[PDB]
Design a protein around this ligand. Sequence first.
Ligand SMILES: Cc1cc2nc3c(=O)[nH]c(=O)nc-3n(C[C@H](O)[C@H](O)[C@H](O)COP(=O)(O)OP(=O)(O)OC[C@H]3O[C@@H](n4cnc5c(N)ncnc54)[C@H](O)[C@@H]3O)c2cc1C
Length: 501
Amino acid sequence: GGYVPAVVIGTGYGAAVSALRLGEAGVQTLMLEMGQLWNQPGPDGNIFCGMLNPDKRSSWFKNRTEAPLGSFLWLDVVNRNIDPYAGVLDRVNYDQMSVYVGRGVGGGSLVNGGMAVEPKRSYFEEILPRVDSSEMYDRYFPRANSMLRVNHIDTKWFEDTEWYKFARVSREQAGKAGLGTVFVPNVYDFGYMQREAAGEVPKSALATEVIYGNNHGKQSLDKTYLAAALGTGKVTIQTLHQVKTIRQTKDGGYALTVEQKDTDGKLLATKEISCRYLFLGAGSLGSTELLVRARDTGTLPNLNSEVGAGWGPNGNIMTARANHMWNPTGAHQSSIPALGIDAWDNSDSSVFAEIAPMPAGLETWVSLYLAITKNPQRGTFVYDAATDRAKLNWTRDQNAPAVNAAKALFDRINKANGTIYRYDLFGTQLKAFADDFCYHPLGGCVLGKATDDYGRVAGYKNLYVTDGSLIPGSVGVNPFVTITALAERNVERIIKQDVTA
Ligand SMILES: Cc1cc2nc3c(=O)[nH]c(=O)nc-3n(C[C@H](O)[C@H](O)[C@H](O)COP(=O)(O)OP(=O)(O)OC[C@H]3O[C@@H](n4cnc5c(N)ncnc54)[C@H](O)[C@@H]3O)c2cc1C
């Protein structure tokens, strides 16, 4: 342990942006990540497990693998008992909500679908009226786009390849309902994907990999921002180090208690690490838990009442349509979405939907969708001193507005095509809409609420939040581009106004 000028907690999008710009500014920075650096070939020779061969690497400290949501009827047959291990995907279970997050150097960038989408400007202006939207769209969205290595599918290759038949089927069905589709930019390299389909490079997206990591193709943050941060010479990353408490001492700045564990979860050491500037990039769940705990255990007692508040799941809802026999979606489905349905107009009926692949590897006739909706309901994280956890108080009825909007859109598609929903994909009770999961947790430490308009935590100096906990519950699109661009904005201002090299 010891002192380092800047500490960044976590290594997801907010953290990675912050560490790069700190290091470029000459500020010696230590990143603390609770998960692994994913660079050691495993027993199959690969870093990551695929969706048809899950093992302990798939899961953060669970004793059994799980099928990706939507796929249980086909993928339960590959599930196995596993040792609890520091694997890459954590399903965090709350009372009535399961939030999925990445664990490792790169955070959710390791496990996500790569979809890189800028929000609608008029919606950005609605959710964050205190922010100057011209500087976001003129400067920080472009900077994020370039640094993340966003790229665009070859639309002619898209049209021709078997691997996107599933997307084409939903496009034609939507089209009968008078709905067009949009191509979705991605950080998975689409040139690599063409080499995969040609047999020239190892398959990853085209071998049912994404949610437990991609062994190839996906430009996760370890390849982009974090590689650049290490390249500054001013940034180091310590792994299997979980920050537990944050306090003030006579040294000035902040002092952390940090548990070092092995990959089996055994406690090896508790370290004291301290800093002048402290940046929280532990995600919506992790940053909020740290600050709720610090407030309610009295280590940072002047934190305000908005710490913990304002959480939402980005309106996330999953649903599925049963195609007729003559409209198969194909046995070969790229694991990386390329198409969406943009029915988002900022009204309460708004939906932005991903046309999601089914990883079964054989024909199912299912079209799967992940809808993003506009639902004003919010939850709060409440400290439980008995277990030393933040607990999210969300109830399943709070997703009714999200379900309603999703269903109105997909009812229009079903009606135009003579199809019905599947009701059997999400457990044994009949349920067409999965309404108790989240891939896109947003809020808990909302920008301008718990913090100033640049993520400076209210009540404290040189204490910053950088990540999805800043966003007010919803962005109307897949969120990592927004998180990245906001982080670019915030750290540039913080370095200029607050920091010394
Ligand atoms: C299955 C899935 C699919 C998704 N698909 C998309 C997509 O296609 N496009 C999109 O835009 N978004 C997608 N997302 C969401 C996106 O990945 C997240 O919005 C984004 O990763 C959030 O970034 P963040 O910086 O807030 O936190 P995270 O990326 O979650 O990173 C937080 C990091 O902090 C670490 N950490 C947490 N607590 C501590 C602690 N106390 N001490 C040390 N380290 C800690 C974590 O282990 C993690 O590495 C998806 C996510 C999932 C799970």
